[PDB]
Structures are given as structure tokens and as C-alpha cells.
């Protein structure tokens, strides 16, 4: 019956079964899923099985300055129109099947290390095209609720940076993972640290700090050393613009503590100009590749002291047994100094 | 071609003088002393970050060193005048209701802004939502009282720093000045002290606005001929 027919939207809403007790709690899983298809997509108004040519609807109204008359495609030429529509249909299906993959993160199933792109442009025509966003942690948080039982939310940790010293991180929380991504990355760009870099490639001095139970020991390194650090530190260092550094993470390996512990230590590093100003002395760099040549890296802006810095025969500085055990050849580890991909 | 000369003759010239608006003539250690600016809270209420600015305790009542107040007040008045000269938005903030009416009148008279009422969460850090995406925030926030009515720092002190807005603030001996850009140690309770502060800032702001008009007008007359 003509009167029992419904619209395509009604037919797909029923057939797809996207609303229902199956889809409420994901009580039904979908290895095989009905996929919505637009059946009016490649259809031309006026085209029918009989192959009639209606002037002004599916063929031109005027031909050679005269109004066309009703005509009908012959069986042979109509057959080719139908065949061409079938190929155009399978061709459209093939093009959709083709999609460009995205590079994985630290592992195939991990979100960590994946780029999210630049933060969204601010309301007042503000833009952050120079900034890259990286995921550091994606967690499923489960909240027990008074009436709804265990609910599932997403906590995301992301880092942003422009590669020129400006970098930040933010937590994002939303029911949907994509919303948590948008919240974190947009917030992080408003909490940017500036990180000082020696020669725009490394840190100014060795940094050893503890944040809660997470210990981070960082070493200044020369050019070509690369980033030999915890994978999360590598990701953050690329956003900051640090190319050469060694880092060792000990104690609790908590991503959040590590992230904010790392930013705390990198934001409190004294530059050579600050050292010269504080002590009113020249900062002289000795490089073994340059021999005994003294390279002044920083000079005090204010007056220059005349009294040499006291030479304490033995410094009372605290040492790391790991650093000393390595320098004495007593550090044996099958995992240290292993060959790895360029970082 | 003509913009560089404008910014150089009008915007950069005041910054080459130590007291371009002569704000040192507005007050003296004696004038501050007569307004009881040196009177602080009892020693038990002292904040440890205010100890540098305290002259001593007179029978368990802290005395604020007016020699420092005069130096800090000079800087705060100088900064305020320069920001008014540059046509910056100046917002006065205080929760002390004894002076709410006085402060609102002083702001209206100098052509600036006052917020003496309950401070709603996010006025500064969420302003675009509260006011609109094109809202302009204040360029300078002046606290005549830095504490709220439960004796904690006014939330706008932290939120002004978050939004990178410089703050001038009268800081009594029980207050925390760490995040105040230009603090002025002084009595925040006595009506004579508060009235003095309002006169000084009102005058500094009004003078700087008139100076801006004088310079602009002269720069135009000379430009035509």
C-alpha cells in the first residue's frame, strides 16, 4: 500500500537501532553494524527506469533554439545509463573505503605521544598555529553515583608547546574523550611556561628535583646527544625545543607528577646571565673540543667584582651514587646505553 | 611616518622623567603622619611579609615606617599617574563597607571604575563569558583594602595576577603584599588614612588625564603649522 510507506529518516532510525536499551548501556556490541546510507545521493530528479527524457527536468529545455519534445532513451542507451550508475555507486563506495591513517603513539593502542594539532583559535581572532599539542595520558575514570551506579568519564593530560621555549600542560575532564581533548589543549595554552634553553638546544645546568614521590634527574648535554629520556619527557622536550638532554625518572612514575615536576624544574633553572649578575663575575665556558680557549658566555651588567671567588679546597656538594658509580666503571646494566631510534 | 613621532613625543616622553606628574608634591611624611597612616594592627595580627615595612611595635601595636610608605607611595602614585596618562582603565576595589560610598564617588569623579560590592567568581578570569568576548579588562587595579570581610586576601588580588594586571594596594600590617605589584604600607582602617589615599589617587589620576590633553593639544597645534 502507498499509504503504509514511510520516509527514509523514519526507516533508518528504526533499522539502525541507535536509540534503545541496547544502546543505552552498550548492552549490544557492534562487530556487524547497520550503516546509514543516503539513497538520494546520486539520484537525479527526472531519471526513471523507463528512460524518459523530460525537457526542462533531466534534459535541456531548448536544443538548437527549439523546445525539445518528450523522448525516451532506447533500450541499448538506457542500459548503459543504468550500468554507469552502478559503477558510479561502487566507485563512490570504494573512495569512501579509502582513508588516510594516523601515526601511532608510544604504542599501537596507547594515546600517549599522539598529536592533537594546534589549540583552537580564541574568540577574539586569537590563533595558536605555532603551537603543537601532544597527549601524555588518557585515563578512564569511574565514578560511583547515588542513583546511576558506576559512571564512566575521561581524564586527559595534554602538553602544548611552540618549540621555542613556550610550553604548558593541562588536565581535561569530560564524558567524551574528544571533549576532554578540547578542554585540556585549549586550557594549556593559557598556562604557558617559558623555559630557558642553553644555545636553544639544551638546559643551562643539571637539574635534580623531587615532586611528591617522583624523582627527575636531568643532565645538560652537548649537541648531537639527542633526547635520552622517559618517553613522556621526550614528547615534552620536543614541544619546549630541547634537543639534547639526559633524564632519569625514579620513584613513583606518575605521569601527572612527572609532567608538573618536569615543568617546575625547567622553569627554575638559572641562566648564565643570571649567574653572572648574581655573583658579579664572568661566566667562562671551557670546551675540550676548543682546548684551553676561554669562552666568556656571560658578563655581569653591573660592576665587576675584583675579589676572586673563594677556592674551597673541597666542595660540600651532595653527589648521586648513580653518577659516581658510572664514572668509576662500576655501573653494570644490560639496559643502559642501548641502541635506539633517533629521538 | 607620523605615528612614530606621535608615540615618541606623547607616549615615550613621559617615561624619560623620574616624576613627570610631580606626585611627590601631593604628600609628605608629616601629612601621612597626621592621617594616622603609621598606625597598624596589633602584633598578634602581623603578617610576616609585612615585617620589612614595620618601624616597630608601640606597646604591642605595630607602627608602619612612613619613610618607606613615602617611597612606596611615590612609586604607586607615579605608576597610577602614568597609567591614567596612557588612558588605561583603572579599577578601585575594596570590600570595607565603611568606605564603599566614598570610594565609588572618588572613582566616578576621576573618571575611573570602582568595585566595592561582593566580588562574583570569575569577574576577571571568566570576563568574556560574563561581559562578552570583546570586553576590555582593567589595565590597573587599585586596592584600598586588600582583605575581604573574613580577613582573607581579596580574590581579585590573585585573579589580577592571573590576568597579568598590575595592582596598587594599601597593605596594612596584617595583609599579604607578595602578589601586589606596587604595595603601599599604610593604615587601611582609619577614615583619615582612607580619605587621604582617595584624595591622592584621585588627584594623581585627574592630573595625568589633564596632562595628556595638554600634550595632545600642543602636539596638534604645532603639527598644522
Amino acid at each position: 500500500s502507498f499509504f503504509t510507506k514511510l520516509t527514509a529518516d523514519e526507516l533508518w532510525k528504526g533499522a539502525l537501532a541507535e536509540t534503545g536499551a541496547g544502546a543505552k548501556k552498550g548492552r549490544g556490541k557492534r562487530t556487524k553494524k547497520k550503516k546509514r546510507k543516503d539513497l538520494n545521493r546520486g539520484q537525479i530528479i527526472g531519471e526513471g527506469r523507463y528512460g524518459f527524457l523530460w525537457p526542462g527536468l533531466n534534459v535541456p529545455l531548448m536544443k538548437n533554439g527549439a523546445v525539445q519534445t518528450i523522448a525516451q532513451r532506447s533500450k541499448e542507451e538506457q542500459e548503459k545509463v543504468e550500468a554507469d550508475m552502478i559503477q558510479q555507486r561502487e566507485e563512490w563506495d570504494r573512495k569512501k573505503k579509502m582513508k588516510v591513517k594516523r601515526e601511532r603513539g608510544w604504542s599501537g593502542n596507547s594515546w600517549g605521544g599522539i598529536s592533537l594539532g594546534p589549540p583552537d583559535p580564541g574568540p577574539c581572532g586569537e590563533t595558536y598555529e605555532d603551537f603543537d599539542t601532544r597527549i601524555l595520558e588518557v585515563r578512564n575514570v569511574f565514578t560511583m553515583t547515588a542513583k546511576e551506579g558506576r559512571k564512566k568519564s575521561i581524564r586527559v593530560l595534554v602538553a602544548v608547546g611552540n618549540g621555542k621555549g613556550a610550553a604548558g600542560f593541562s588536565i581535561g575532564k569530560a564524558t567524551d574523550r574528544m571533549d576532554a581533548f578540547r578542554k585540556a589543549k585549549n586550557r594549556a595554552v593559557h598556562h604557558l611556561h617559558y623555559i630557558e634553553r642553553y644555545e636553544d638546544h639544551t638546559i643551562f645546568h643539571d637539574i635534580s628535583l623531587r615532586f611528591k614521590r617522583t624523582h627527575i634527574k636531568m643532565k645538560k648535554q652537548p649537541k648531537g646527544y639527542g633526547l635520552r629520556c622517559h618517553r613522556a619527557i621526550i614528547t615534552i622536550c620536543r614541544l619546549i625545543g630541547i634537543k639534547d638532554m639526559y633524564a632519569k625518572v625514579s620513584g613513583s612514575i606518575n605521569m601527572l607528577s612527572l609532567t608538573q615536576g618536569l615543568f617546575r624544574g625547567l622553569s627554575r633553572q638559572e641562566t648564565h646571565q643570571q649567574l653572572a649578575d648574581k655573583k658579579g663575575l664572568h661566566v667562562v665556558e671551557i670546551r675540550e673540543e676548543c682546548g684551553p680557549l676561554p669562552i666568556v658566555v656571560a658578563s655581569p651588567r653591573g660592576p665587576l667584582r675584583k675579589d676572586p671567588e673563594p677556592e674551597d679546597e673541597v666542595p660540600d656538594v651532595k653527589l648521586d651514587w648513580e653518577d659516581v658509580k658510572t664514572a668509576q666503571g662500576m655501573k653494570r646494566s644490560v639496559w643502559s646505553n642501548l641502541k635506539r631510534a633517533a629521538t | 611616518e607620523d605615528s612614530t613621532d606621535f608615540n615618541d613625543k606623547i607616549l615615550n616622553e613621559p617615561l624619560k622623567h623620574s616624576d613627570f606628574f610631580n606626585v611627590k608634591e601631593l604628600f609628605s611624611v608629616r601629612s601621612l603622619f597626621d592621617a594616622r597612616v603609621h598606625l597598624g594592627h596589633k602584633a598578634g595580627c602581623r603578617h610576616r611579609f609585612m615585617e620589612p615595612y614595620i618601624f616597630g611595635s608601640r606597646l604591642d601595636h605595630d607602627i608602619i615606617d612612613l619613610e618607606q610608605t613615602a617611597t612606596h607611595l611615590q612609586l604607586a602614585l607615579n605608576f597610577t599617574a602614568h597609567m591614567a596618562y596612557r588612558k588605561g582603565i583603572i579599577l578601585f576595589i575594596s570590600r570595607n563597607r565603611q568606605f564603599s560610598y566614598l570610594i565609588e564617588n572618588m572613582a566616578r569623579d576621576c573618571g575611573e571604575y570602582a568595585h566595592t560590592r561582593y566580588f562574583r567568581g570569575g569577574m576577571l578570569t571568566n570576563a568574556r563569558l560574563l561581559f562578552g568576548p570583546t570586553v576590555r579588562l582593567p589595565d590597573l587595579i587599585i586596592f584600598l583594602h586588600t582583605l575581604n570581610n573574613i580577613f582573607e586576601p581579596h580574590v581579585a588580588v590573585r585573579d589580577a595576577a592571573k590576568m597579568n594586571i598590575p595592582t596598587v594596594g594599601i597593605v596594612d600590617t596584617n595583609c599579604n603584599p607578595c602578589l601586589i605589584t606596587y604595595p603601599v604600607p599604610g593604615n587601611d582602617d582609619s577614615p583619615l588614612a582612607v580619605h587621604l589615599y582617595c584624595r591622592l589617587f584621585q588627584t594623581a589620576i585627574t592630573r595625568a588625564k589633564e596632562k595628556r590633553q595638554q600634550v595632545e593639544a600642543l602636539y596638534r597645534l604645532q603639527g598644522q603649522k
Binding site: 502507498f2 499509504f3 527536468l57 529545455l61 | -
Partner: protein, 132 residues
């Protein structure tokens, strides 16, 4: 919970027209009727036939102007005249709208044995009343 003709709340992203946004209890209060005829007045006949004709005309126009209708049809009957008033989009070329107007008016006049006229109002896009 009542379901009839209620566009349920979403996340604030579903554009609805004025008609779609109003549940049935607002009929005759905030929204009018989509067809006007005399069959449902007291003492009047042929309500059954007028109703079947309306259901057909709505399906006929939906499939005759596929993807073009931007709102429900308004059906008006005066005497033996039948007026179909439709809000359509501005995607189809004007030549195709004139072909379909001439075609539909003629075919429907011979089907229901009455003078049928089609009045088209074009809008650049579906008019949105609110985002549910």
C-alpha cells in the same frame, strides 16, 4: 513519558523549525493547523475524503520535490479550489521548479478533479527556531 510529536532534547545542536519544536498540546495555542477545510466543522460531511487527500498530497509533494521542502505543507481549500503552499529551498534551478509546478498542478487537478494551484516560497536555508 509522552512521545507523540515531541522533538526530544539533544546536546543543543539539533536545529528544529517552529512547527517541530511544539508538541501537540500547543496546537491551537501556539501553532495553527497545517490544513484548513470545512469537513471537521459540526454538521459538515466528507471529513474522511478530505483527510485521505491531504495524506496523499503530502506524500506526493515530498517525493515530487525531493530534498527541496524546507517545512510541512500548508493545504488550503476554498470552494472547489485546492491551494498547496510549500516552503522550498534555493538549490534546484528555477527551470526545474517551473517544470514541477506545471507538472504537479496539472496531474493533481486531473487526479482529484479540481483546480489545484501550487504556491512556492523559497528560503536560502531551513529556518531554525531553536537548537534542541
Amino acid at each position: 513519558k509522552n512521545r507523540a510529536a515531541r522533538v526530544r532534547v539533544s546536546k543543543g545542536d539539533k536545529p528544529v523549525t517552529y512547527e517541530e519544536a511544539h508538541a501537540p498540546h500547543y496546537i491551537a495555542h501556539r501553532k495553527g493547523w497545517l490544513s484548513l477545510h470545512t469537513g471537521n466543522l459540526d454538521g459538515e460531511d466528507h471529513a474522511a475524503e478530505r483527510t485521505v487527500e491531504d495524506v496523499f498530497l503530502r506524500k506526493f509533494m515530498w517525493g515530487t520535490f525531493p530534498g527541496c521542502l524546507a517545512d510541512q505543507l500548508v493545504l488550503k481549500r476554498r470552494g472547489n479550489q485546492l491551494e498547496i503552499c510549500a516552503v522550498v529551498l534555493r538549490q534546484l534551478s528555477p527551470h526545474k521548479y517551473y517544470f514541477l509546478v506545471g507538472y504537479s498542478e496539472t496531474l493533481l487537478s486531473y487526479f482529484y478533479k479540481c483546480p489545484v494551484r501550487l504556491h512556492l516560497q523559497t528560503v536560502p536555508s531551513k529556518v531554525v527556531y531553536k537548537y534542541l
